[PDB]
Structure 1
Amino acid sequence: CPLRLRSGILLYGYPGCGKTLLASAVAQQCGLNFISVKGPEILNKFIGASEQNIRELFERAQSVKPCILFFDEFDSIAPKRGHDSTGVTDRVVNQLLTQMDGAEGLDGVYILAATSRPDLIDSALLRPGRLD
C-alpha cells in the first residue's frame, strides 16, 4: 500500500479511567520505543527552546526504530490558539501540528496523547492523519 497508515490517535475519557496505564503498557505488548514525555518538560520558560524541545523529541523518535510518543495532560501542551497572550503556547502548537506535516520519516513513529478535556485542544490537530 502506498498510503500513510493511521498512526496518531487521541485518548480521552472519564478521569482516572486507566488511559495512563494502557498508554504505558502497549509499548511492551507491541514492542517499540516508548519515549514518554511530561507535558511541562516540553514547554520552557525561555523562547527558542520549546520548539527546540519538541524538535529534539521528534529527532529522537525518528532516530530510533518505529517509535511511540506519548503526551500526558495533552490539553495543557496544545491550548486553543490565539487566546494565549505570551504566544509561546500558540507557536508550540503550530510546531506540533507541523511535525506531522514532515515529508518522510513519519513512518513507524506513532503519536499518542491523553487528556480528559478534548475541548481545550484546538481541533486543527484532530485533522485525520495527525489524530484521526
Structure 2
Amino acid sequence: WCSFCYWYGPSLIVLDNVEALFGKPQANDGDPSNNGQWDNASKLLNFFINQVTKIFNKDNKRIRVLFSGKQKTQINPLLFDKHFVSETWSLRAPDKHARAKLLEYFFSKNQIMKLNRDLQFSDLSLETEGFSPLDLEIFTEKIFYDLQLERDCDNVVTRELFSKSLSAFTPSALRGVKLTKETNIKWGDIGALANAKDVLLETLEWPTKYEPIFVNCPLRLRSGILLYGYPGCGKTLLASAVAQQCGLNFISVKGPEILNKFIGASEQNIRELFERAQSVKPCILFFDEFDSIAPKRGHDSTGVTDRVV
C-alpha cells in the first residue's frame, strides 16, 4: 500500500471498519502488567504509523489516511498517543428535515411508490424520529410489502397502512433491548395549573425552538424547576406528559429506591444517573419523592443523607 500510494502522487488510503484489523483486543479488565495489551495488532498499527510517518515527513501532500470505526475512543489509543490523528467529525443521527429529505429518494430509489394524497412527507418525518438511514430503507420495503399483499391497492400509500406498518417494527438501535416504557402519553390533560404550566413549557422548549438567538446567549440557561404540591395531585403524570412532549428524553429516580444502608451505593446511585444521562442526550432527570433525599438542612448528625446531598 505505501509503495503504490507513494508512487501514485497525492493520494489517500481509506480503511473502512478499521477496528477489524488495527483494533485493540480490549483488556476485559485483565492484567495490565504484561505490557498491557501490546498484542500483534497494536504492533501492526505501530508499524503502519512508522512507515507512513516516514513518507509524510517528505511531502505532506503525498499521502493522507482516512480511518473509520464505530466510535472514536474504542479505536486503538496509540493513534491518539503518537498524535497520528486529530479530527472529531461524527455522523450524528439525522433528524427532522433530513428524514423527509431522503425518505422520498427511497420511495423512488428502485421501486416507484406514490405518497398519500395531499402530503409532502411533512409528518412522515415527525414519526419514526429515531430511525437511522438503515432503518428507513427497511421501513420503505415494509410499506411496499404491506400494501402489495393487500391485492386491491398497489399505487398509493394510506395513513391507516402506515399506522399498521409502524407497529411490529423497531429501530435497529434498541432493537434487541425489548424495552417498553412511557406508554402513558397524556399531554392532552390540560390540568388545573395550565395558568402557569406555560412557564415550564417555556423553560424547557423555547431555548431549543428559537435556536439561532440562543446561540448568542452569554449566560448559562435557566434549566432547573421544582414543584411542591398537596400529596399526589397529578405530579408524576405531569412529569410524564412533559417528558412525552419528546423535545427531551426522560429518565427518573424515585427517592426511597436509592437510600441503601450501604455507605457507598447510597451516593454511587446518584452518579449512576448522571453518568448515563450525560452519555446520551439532553434529559429531564426527574426526581420523584425528592423530600426523602433532602437532608432537612442537617449538619450535626452528618448522616449518610448529608453524603448523598
More strand by share: 1
Indicate the residue corresponding to 2:267 in structure 1.
51
Q: Unaligned 5+ residue runs, structure 2?
A: 1-216
Question: Is 1:90 aligned to 2:298, yes or no?
Answer: no
Question: Is 1:37 aligned to 2:243, yes or no?
Answer: no
- How far residue 45 of structure 1 moved from its aligned partner, in angstroms, is 1.1
Change over 3 Å in CA distance of 1:86–1:46 after alignment to 2: farther
Indicate the residue corresponding to 1:10 in structure 2.
226
Change over 3 Å in CA distance of 1:57–1:44 after alignment to 2: same
Considering only CA atoms, is the larger Rg found in Structure 1 or Structure 2? 2
Change over 3 Å in CA distance of 1:59–1:28 after alignment to 2: same
> How many residues align structurally?
93
TM-score, scaled to structure 2:
0.28
Read off the aligned partner of 2:307 and give its amino acid letter.
Answer: R
Tell me, yes or no, if the aligned pair for 1:80 and 1:90 is still in contact at 8 Å.
Answer: no
- How far residue 67 of structure 1 moved from its aligned partner, in angstroms, is 0.8
User: Residue 27 of structure 1 is aligned with which of 243, 247, 253?
Assistant: 243
Distance (whole Å) between structure 2 residues aligned to residue 24 and residue 42 of structure 1 = 21
TM-score, scaled to structure 1:
0.63
Distance (whole Å) between structure 2 residues aligned to residue 84 and residue 68 of structure 1 = 33
- How far residue 38 of structure 1 moved from its aligned partner, in angstroms, is 1.5
Change over 3 Å in CA distance of 1:68–1:84 after alignment to 2: farther
Runs of 4+ with deviation above 4 angstroms:
none
Change over 3 Å in CA distance of 1:10–1:84 after alignment to 2: farther
Tell me, yes or no, if the aligned pair for 1:32 and 1:68 is still in contact at 8 Å.
Answer: yes
- How far residue 8 of structure 1 moved from its aligned partner, in angstroms, is 0.7
User: Residue 80 of structure 1 is aligned with which of 296, 300, 303?
Assistant: 296
Distance (whole Å) between structure 2 residues aligned to residue 82 and residue 42 of structure 1 = 19
Distance (whole Å) between structure 2 residues aligned to residue 84 and residue 73 of structure 1 = 24
Distance (whole Å) between structure 2 residues aligned to residue 60 and residue 73 of structure 1 = 21
CA RMSD across the alignment: 1.8
Distance (whole Å) between structure 2 residues aligned to residue 84 and residue 78 of structure 1 = 15
* DSSP 3-state at the match of 2:250: strand
Change over 3 Å in CA distance of 1:28–1:46 after alignment to 2: same
Distance (whole Å) between structure 1 residues aligned to residue 269 and residue 288 of structure 2 = 16
Read off the aligned partner of 1:88 and give its amino acid letter.
Answer: V
Read off the aligned partner of 2:256 and give its amino acid letter.
Answer: P
Read off the aligned partner of 1:46 and give its amino acid letter.
Answer: F
- How far residue 64 of structure 1 moved from its aligned partner, in angstroms, is 1.3
Read off the aligned partner of 2:294 and give its amino acid letter.
Answer: A
Read off the aligned partner of 1:62 and give its amino acid letter.
Answer: Q
- How far residue 30 of structure 1 moved from its aligned partner, in angstroms, is 4.0
Change over 3 Å in CA distance of 1:84–1:35 after alignment to 2: farther
- How far residue 18 of structure 1 moved from its aligned partner, in angstroms, is 1.1
List per-residue Cα deviations over 1:63-87 (Å, max 9, x = no partner): 1111111111111111213267461
Which gives a bigger RCO, structure 1 or 2 (Cα 8 Å, sep 6+)?
A: 1
